[PDB]
Symmetry: C2
Amino acid sequence: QLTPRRPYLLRAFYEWLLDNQLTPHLVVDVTLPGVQVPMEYARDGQIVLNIAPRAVGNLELANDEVRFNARFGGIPRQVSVPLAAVLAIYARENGAGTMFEPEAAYD
Amino acid sequence: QLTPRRPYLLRAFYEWLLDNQLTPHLVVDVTLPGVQVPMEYARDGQIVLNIAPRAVGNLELANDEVRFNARFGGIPRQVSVPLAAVLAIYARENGAGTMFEPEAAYD
């Protein structure tokens, strides 16, 4: 009945990480549908994308999707990750962050 | 280690609740140092403060403290609650929300 909270938590942890001068990495499960990522880096069914302001462009941490574009292997790429497919957000350095609990809306 | 995330979590749930058209209330510990709330309404050490945009003014959910203006008992009052004293946030209509985990920075 109520919307999922995952995108809001993702935004808060993202900011939190940035304020602690950390490099946020999004952990995505590329097995799910709608996931548009550079599969060449996916391994064991999941991919870890650096989403720091520096490393990416046009970042939109929306409720429906996490979108952005960046160059991989020298090729411009447009990335789209349904929130359903967002596993966790960790800092590359320390590891601080969180794994998102499953939610009814993402079934 | 790192700074506390409660402020960011507080902001996210606050956003999440309003987006679901719910009424967010704070649950404050009036026992801690620096808490500035209209004590007349505190009950057994805690005060439930409605923080919806209407029932409040100049709401500031900063990292250090929650500040806002409101009138309690016909008299205009300034509320100020150090993040350390915020126990939980929740929707008055369905109890949706969360109680914050204790964090190091607040000992």
